[PDB]
Amino acid sequence: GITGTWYNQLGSTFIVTAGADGALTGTYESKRYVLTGRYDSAPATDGSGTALGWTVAWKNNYRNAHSATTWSGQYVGGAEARINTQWLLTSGTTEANAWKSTLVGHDTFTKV
Amino acid sequence: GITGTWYNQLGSTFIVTAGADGALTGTYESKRYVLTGRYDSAPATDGSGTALGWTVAWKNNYRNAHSATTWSGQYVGGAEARINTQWLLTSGTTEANAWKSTLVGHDTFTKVKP
Amino acid sequence: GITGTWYNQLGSTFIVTAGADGALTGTYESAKRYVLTGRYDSAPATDGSGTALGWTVAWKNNYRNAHSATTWSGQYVGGAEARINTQWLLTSGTTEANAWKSTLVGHDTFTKVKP
Amino acid sequence: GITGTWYNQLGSTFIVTAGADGALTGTYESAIKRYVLTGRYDSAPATDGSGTALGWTVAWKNNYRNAHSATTWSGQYVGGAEARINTQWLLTSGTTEANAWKSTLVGHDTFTKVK
Numbered sequence: 001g002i003t004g005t006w007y008n009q010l011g012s013t014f015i016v017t018a019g020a021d022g023a024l025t026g027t028y029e030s031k032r033y034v035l036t037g038r039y040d041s042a043p044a045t046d047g048s049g050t051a052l053g054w055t056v057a058w059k060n061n062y063r064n065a066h067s068a069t070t071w072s073g074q075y076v077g078g079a080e081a082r083i084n085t086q087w088l089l090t091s092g093t094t095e096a097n098a099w100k101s102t103l104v105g106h107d108t109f110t111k112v
Numbered sequence: 113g114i115t116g117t118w119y120n121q122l123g124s125t126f127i128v129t130a131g132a133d134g135a136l137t138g139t140y141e142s143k144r145y146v147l148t149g150r151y152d153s154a155p156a157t158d159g160s161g162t163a164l165g166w167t168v169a170w171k172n173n174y175r176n177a178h179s180a181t182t183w184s185g186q187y188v189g190g191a192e193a194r195i196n197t198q199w200l201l202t203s204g205t206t207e208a209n210a211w212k213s214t215l216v217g218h219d220t221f222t223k224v225k226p
Numbered sequence: 227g228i229t230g231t232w233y234n235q236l237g238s239t240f241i242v243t244a245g246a247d248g249a250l251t252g253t254y255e256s257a258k259r260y261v262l263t264g265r266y267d268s269a270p271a272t273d274g275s276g277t278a279l280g281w282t283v284a285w286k287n288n289y290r291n292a293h294s295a296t297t298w299s300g301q302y303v304g305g306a307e308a309r310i311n312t313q314w315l316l317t318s319g320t321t322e323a324n325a326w327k328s329t330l331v332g333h334d335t336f337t338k339v340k341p
Numbered sequence: 342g343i344t345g346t347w348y349n350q351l352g353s354t355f356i357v358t359a360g361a362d363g364a365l366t367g368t369y370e371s372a373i374k375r376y377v378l379t380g381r382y383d384s385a386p387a388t389d390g391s392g393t394a395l396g397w398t399v400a401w402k403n404n405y406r407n408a409h410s411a412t413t414w415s416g417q418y419v420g421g422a423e424a425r426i427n428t429q430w431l432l433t434s435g436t437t438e439a440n441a442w443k444s445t446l447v448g449h450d451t452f453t454k455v456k
């Protein structure tokens with residue numbers, strides 16, 4: 001249920017393929033960046049979500065923010081499917097600025 | 113300088129290869145699990161670290177914890193070469209338990225076991 | 227703005243008073259009451275930015291002790307429907323061996339209308 | 342074991358009094374640089390070797406400066422000759438809704454009784 005196009009509350013577009021091997025591969029758009037990650041290819045069937053995560057390093061051929069975001073979350077299936085995530089965005093910093101290297105937030109992705 | 117075998121303060125083993133276009137691939141042992149991630153393949157040249165992240169889903173041929181961890185951090189080269197990270201570990205939960213789905217912590221990786 | 231009774235998406239009840247000096251006091255009931263204390267910016271920017279704040283509950287009261295504490299860090303956002311948007315850290319007391327898994331993280335959004 | 346002066350890895354000083362029923366009150370200096378803090382701790386921790394859960398908040402306004410932000414530290418106190426308070430923290434800045442996605446920094450501080 002994960003493969004396809006997803007949208008978050010900021011209007012970002014998360015395009016992903018969930019491979020048989022547990023891989024996530026795709027692109028993330030605020031402008032498009034590569035992502036890769038992993039998901040549980042044998043989730044519980046007890047009403048639990050499917051655990052997953054992915055990373056975008058914010059460099060493409062045109063731009064580079066010298067940073068990377070990881071999203072950690074779970075896919076929740078059904079008629080109103082969602083991927084509910086929390087994320088960590090680390091910027092490359094000097095040692096003096098490392099204490100403020102990392103932003104934290106939460107994104108919810110929907111198929112609509 | 114990211115490619116290699118790293119260990120964190122818990123004694124976990126992070127074996128990683130960094131590709132020229134930003135890919136991270138390898139294994140993690142907290143009995144290995146696959147990892148994949150991304151890193152900044154052209155970092156600033158002003159002393160700043162190199163941003164990176166990776167994911168492990170905690171399923172292999174022997175175990176499944178129905179969970180995934182992402183590490184987000186930066187590689188710092190030089191005399192004290194290290195990868196400093198923070199991580200989010202999400203377990204698959206029912207909706208009723210979703211509020212407690214996610215653990216947070218911080219791991220520092222070096223080339224020497226603890 | 228901040229003073230009042232708030233509810234999060236879980237249906238928890240956050241009863242808070244914001245003192246002129248920057249103090250937050252009150253009670254929290256997660257879906258009996260627990261004591262909370264915290265702080266807020268009592269002279270926020272006047273440029274449309276939210277008001278930074280945070281508070282702590284240690285999960286011990288007369289009835290129960292979970293041996294844990296949550297801190298919520300966030301901002302009050304004035305609006306047609308006023309919000310307090312937070313992220314939180316819940317640390318349980320653990321042995322050293324279990325310290326790696328001591329801390330849950332999440333996010334709660336509060337309004338003065340119960341969902 | 343919590344009342345007293347604590348120092349973290351950044352050079353900050355955390356001065357706190359732990360009251361009998363769970364109050365934390367004191368001051369935090371990220372080095373004019375002193376700010377009020379308040380929080381809560383578990384005043385009846387487990388007796389199985391587990392740490393003592395606690396949390397506190399600083400809003401970064403004093404009489405001389407206002408950074409329009411607040412940090413909460415959530416963690417546990419671990420006793421012994423080399424007592425420590427191990428924390429994770431969330432620092433929320435007041436922002437517009439458009440910048441709210443980047444409102445919150447996260448990190449970790451270790452406090453000890455010596456510098």
Ligand SMILES: O=C(CCCC[C@@H]1SC[C@@H]2NC(=O)N[C@@H]21)Nc1ccc([N+](=O)[O-])cc1
Pocket residue numbers: 008010012030058065066067068069087089091105107442443
């Ligand atoms: O490094 C960056 C790159 C862009 C990050 C977009 C974030 S990823 C989490 C969230 N979910 C989304 O769909 N989009 C946002 N930007 C950046 C980093 C730091 C600051 N800063 O002011 O500190 C400003 C911009």
Ligand SMILES: O=C(CCCC[C@@H]1SC[C@@H]2NC(=O)N[C@@H]21)Nc1ccc([N+](=O)[O-])cc1
Pocket residue numbers: 120122124142170177178179180181199201203215217219326327
């Ligand atoms: O889901 C799991 C799988 C194993 C996670 C190992 C974590 S990854 C962050 C940290 N860094 C490491 O090198 N190792 C640890 N375990 C798990 C999850 C939740 C709970 N729990 O009690 O909630 C217990 C075990």
Ligand SMILES: O=C(CCCC[C@@H]1SC[C@@H]2NC(=O)N[C@@H]21)Nc1ccc([N+](=O)[O-])cc1
Pocket residue numbers: 211212234236238255256257285292293294295296314316318330332334
């Ligand atoms: O220690 C506890 C005490 C209750 C915590 C309620 C949390 S505070 C963040 C969130 N917002 C709310 O309004 N309510 C929830 N419970 C607890 C801690 C850990 C685990 N665990 O399984 O790890 C289970 C229960």
Ligand SMILES: O=C(CCCC[C@@H]1SC[C@@H]2NC(=O)N[C@@H]21)Nc1ccc([N+](=O)[O-])cc1
Pocket residue numbers: 099100349351353371401408409410411412430432434448450
């Ligand atoms: O809002 C501020 C006020 C000072 C925060 C000090 C932090 S509290 C967590 C950590 N532990 C310490 O002892 N000290 C640091 N500063 C601030 C906020 C954001 C940015 N920024 O660049 O985004 C810069 C400075």
